[PDB]
From Swiss-Prot, chain A:
Record's protein name: Small ribosomal subunit protein uS3m
Annotated GO CC locations: mitochondrial inner membrane; mitochondrial small ribosomal subunit; mitochondrion
An example Gene Ontology biological process: mitochondrial translation
Included stretch of the parent chain: 36 to 167 of 167
Coiled-coil segments: none
Signal peptide start-end: none
Keyword Plastid: no
Keywords from the UniProt entry: Mitochondrion, Ribonucleoprotein, Ribosomal protein, Transit peptide
From Swiss-Prot, chain C:
Assembly mode: Component of the mitochondrial small ribosomal subunit (mt-SSU). Mature mammalian 55S mitochondrial ribosomes consist of a small (28S) and a large (39S) subunit. The 28S small subunit contains a 12S ribosomal RNA (12S mt-rRNA) and 30 different proteins. The 39S large subunit contains a 16S rRNA (16S mt-rRNA), a copy of mitochondrial valine transfer RNA (mt-tRNA(Val)), which plays an integral structural role, and 52 different proteins. Associated with the 12S mitochondrial rRNA (12S mt-rRNA).
First-to-last residue of the parent protein present: 55 to 208 of 689
Function, as annotated: Mitochondrial RNA-binding protein that has a role in mitochondrial translation.
Organism: Homo sapiens (Human)
Name of the protein in question: Small ribosomal subunit protein mS39
Domain of life: Eukaryota
Coiled coil: none
Each PPR repeat, start to end: 95-129, 130-154
Family, as annotated: Belongs to the mitochondrion-specific ribosomal protein mS39 family.
Disease listed for this protein: Combined oxidative phosphorylation deficiency 51: An autosomal recessive, mitochondrial disorder characterized by intrauterine growth retardation, low birth weight, poor overall growth, progressive limb rigidity, delayed psychomotor development, hearing loss, and optic atrophy. Brain imaging shows abnormal bilateral signs at the basal ganglia and brainstem. Patient cells show decreased mitochondrial complex I and IV levels and activities, and generalized mitochondrial translation defects.
From Swiss-Prot, chain G:
Residues of the full protein shown: 46 to 243 of 323
Cysteine pairs bridged by disulfides in the record: none
Name assigned to this protein: Small ribosomal subunit protein mS35
Cell compartment(s), UniProt: Mitochondrion
Keywords from the named record: Coiled coil, Mitochondrion, Ribonucleoprotein, Ribosomal protein, Transit peptide
Cellular compartments per GO CC: cytosol; mitochondrial inner membrane; mitochondrial small ribosomal subunit; mitochondrion
Gene: MRPS35
Family: Belongs to the mitochondrion-specific ribosomal protein mS35 family.
GO terms of molecular function: RNA binding; structural constituent of ribosome
Subunit structure: Component of the mitochondrial small ribosomal subunit (mt-SSU). Mature mammalian 55S mitochondrial ribosomes consist of a small (28S) and a large (39S) subunit. The 28S small subunit contains a 12S ribosomal RNA (12S mt-rRNA) and 30 different proteins. The 39S large subunit contains a 16S rRNA (16S mt-rRNA), a copy of mitochondrial valine transfer RNA (mt-tRNA(Val)), which plays an integral structural role, and 52 different proteins.
UniProtKB/Swiss-Prot annotation, chain H:
Signal peptide start-end: none
Protein's gene: MRPS14
Name of this protein: Small ribosomal subunit protein uS14m
Disease (UniProt): Combined oxidative phosphorylation deficiency 38: An autosomal recessive disorder due to mitochondrial dysfunction and characterized by perinatal hypertrophic cardiomyopathy, growth retardation, muscle hypotonia, elevated lactate, dysmorphy and intellectual disability.
Entire-sequence positions represented here: 28 to 128 of 128
Any one cellular-component term (Gene Ontology): nuclear membrane
Entry superkingdom: Eukaryota
Amino acid sequence: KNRAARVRVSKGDKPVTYEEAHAPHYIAHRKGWLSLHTGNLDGEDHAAERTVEDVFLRKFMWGTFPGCLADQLVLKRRGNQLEICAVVLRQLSPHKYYFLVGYSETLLSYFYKCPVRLHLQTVPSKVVYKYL
Amino acid sequence: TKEAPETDTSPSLWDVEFAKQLATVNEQPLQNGFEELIQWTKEGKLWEFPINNEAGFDDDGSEFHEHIFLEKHLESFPKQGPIRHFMELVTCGLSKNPYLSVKQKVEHIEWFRNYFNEKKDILKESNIQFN
Amino acid sequence: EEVVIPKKKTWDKVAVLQALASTVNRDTTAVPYVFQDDPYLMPASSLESRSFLLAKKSGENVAKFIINSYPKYFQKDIAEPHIPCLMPEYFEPQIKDISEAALKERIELRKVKASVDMFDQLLQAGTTVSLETTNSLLDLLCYYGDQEPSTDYH
Amino acid sequence: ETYTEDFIKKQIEEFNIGKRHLANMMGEDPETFTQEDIDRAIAYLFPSGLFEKRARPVMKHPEQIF
Amino acid sequence: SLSEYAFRMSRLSARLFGEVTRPTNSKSMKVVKLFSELPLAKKKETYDWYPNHHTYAELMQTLRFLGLYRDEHQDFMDEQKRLKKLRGKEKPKKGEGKRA
Amino acid sequence: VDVPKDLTKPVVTISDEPDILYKRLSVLVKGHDKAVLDSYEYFAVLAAKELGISIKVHEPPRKIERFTLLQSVHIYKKHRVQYEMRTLYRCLELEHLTGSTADVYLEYIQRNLPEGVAMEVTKTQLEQLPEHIKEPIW
Amino acid sequence: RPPRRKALPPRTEKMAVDQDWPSVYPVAAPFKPSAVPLPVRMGYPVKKGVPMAKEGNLELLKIPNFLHLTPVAIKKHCEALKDFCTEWPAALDSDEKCEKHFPIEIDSTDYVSSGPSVRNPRARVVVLRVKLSSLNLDDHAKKKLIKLVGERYCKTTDVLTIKTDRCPLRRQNYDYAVYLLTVLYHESWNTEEWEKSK
Amino acid sequence: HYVDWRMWRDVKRRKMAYEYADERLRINSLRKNTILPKILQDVADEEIAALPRDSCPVRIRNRCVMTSRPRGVKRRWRLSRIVFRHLADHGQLSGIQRATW
Ligand SMILES: [Mg+2]
Ligand SMILES: [Mg+2]
């Protein structure tokens, strides 16, 4: 039996998001990609570097906004701009989100030598697609 | 008004600081997303458009004939024989290398010039006369 | 036959963005662009308008404090063209010799105490300190009043 | 999830207001703005290459959706 | 297998186009190839193959000590190490191992 | 009511140097999503018409690169997972535009290049014969 | 316990149906449900279910939307960009007329990718195309020039293609391509004594 | 802080191979022709053989940059088959999907 990225059935009590509910074969069919860049197009370079950066940014944001991320990150690259789009919860005070946005945008811009912007969308609770 | 300015006037702390008080009177938060791009472009953070893949990279102002014509650098080598034939292949290959600066190409040539000087005795045995 | 080629037009690197910006006006349903465009994160009062930006600036200051305290983590430059404004800043003098050319470094960094100490030692040793440099030392002391300019943290 | 008749009634008010917004975005007459124009405008503004069309962005009358 | 005219016309084109002018065998033409490209070790894919694992580990370790990054993995390891002391399974002092 | 009264216009300086002439600009965009290229095509074509540039569009054949990987961490060689990367193309072919018009149009459409879309713009410049080549010295 | 923070109503509820939308999305920005006044839904629906609403919808966040490039905005944008453009010469009506006045064609390529480095080694390449009919070549010179260039010349089209990519920069490869055209032209007109042995 | 000691040895091999690349290239050029005397080429053989063993580029191994797996690595992403699939199957590799045809 296939295991990769498959939230297995339970007793009908496990809330899953739209992303978590779709196995890999639905990628490009029912769900899109969580990062968009040009490195994986034919004749394009630096796919290795873009991939390492994405893995870091996902770990960095997970530990920088602990308990706040309500879904996977969406990473967008245009030119030398890096856009991080995250769906977060409404538990942390707004002051802490502004501190962490200013802090994260600055630190990541100096780390990867590019203008980095963070776009936060808040939801009252994790959006549930279905109960597996 | 003053007809000839003091172009080489020194920037005293009093003058550098006063110029910072004149940049604070027009200091306002960004109004929209276009102004953020304009600010990043002035600061150098954002790429300039249209895209130029050579932006910020001039190879020391070198001309094409400095990369492709390297025989002026073999004047210290013998004019005939195997050492000339060998160095014509080195310079031929260096003249086809777009990944090296003129400085680096000269370094390759200078390395062989010194290498063959240390091997003068060995070369004399083979009837080759390097300087 | 002859053809007349048009004359070239030149503009600054931001002129196209400035032309596009002229086509848009302020969005009246929105709060200023500096704030996060989210109903939970948008300022709901003049007090939060001021405090939300101060919290964001505080985060930027904490990042810069870290960047300048641990520069070795932020020294790998993968940007082309180079971005001078995204590199760490070094506020310490790198010339440890006692001489005039080492004093001028501490004056550019605006080290009031170090520059005075370096000036006294240099004077006791009997070496000549130029006039232009002596004035450049007064401009620093006379501006800050023999006090150290503010820093991020000591 | 059961959709009470009141919910559908307010979903239709949102679609009619959004229909005029979408027409204003594209610079077209809101009165003659059809469902084919909506689908065309949504495909342009929200381009999705997902192979399954049912997974693509949609802005339809609630009768059709729910 | 070339006429004198063709042989000298090819030698003239080589001069103009910056090719090798002397008669050179295939073995000696490797010298031209060697200096016409970067060595494998000098290619960025080679010497920058790995990301700087020191930088990443040291940066995030520093950010955790500053309270700005929560390392769930490290917190997990710290709790396992804490409970092993209470269980008596502590790391020995170097030189004071069970064998002495 | 709160509208600007006068607007500062970016300074465009007409030079004394003649402008570059481009016979053709071939803008080849590459992406993983056909719908994103359709929207970019619409934007780029509409931008060309408003600026008075002659533009033709066509779709070069797509390229699909496939490769195979083992499915299990250990053994089970006959069980594989196959992956692919789809590169779709759109080609905007612009003709008879000056160098100043090419700088504005390319900057406008390059800045608005969607995430995940690359561009290869091939520019064909018109030049006159060098003066040395006009007559033989011999 | 102090009162918890209430999220404000989405500012789409304050938007008029006759507003200037380009002011809402002036530049490329991620999809914001609170700012986009459209009841758009995305997501494969569950059985007897509807596509998920826009709030908290990651699939709509994944899309490179064109809300900043509405037809109204594009037309306003280009009206401001007309002042930056120059006029193509009217005399150059056809390709044949351009070839007459401008016999040399210079091809270069620029590569736009996403990332921190704008560098691309393919950008240095220069291609120069000329037709031998455009050059002042006599019978001897044209015959000698074709032999020198070899496969660079195409008899069907009568076009000489010189591709230069051995220099680091494009400006160097352009100057080198012109240099090659100059030495090829002048050597074709020179006559050596060994040529009599043809 | 590299994945393991084996990744650390390859890091050092890549650093030393980079430092000696120019020197090795120049000496090799003397050995890779039939133009120079054998007496000179025999000396160049000894010189390149005396250079540090870890300056030799054939000893560099393309290991997975996240797990140090020495085989099953895809050069384009520098990841092992297992790590690549983990990211690809979660939709985190731009443009990569499962292939059916
Ligand atoms: Mg199976
Ligand atoms: Mg091997």
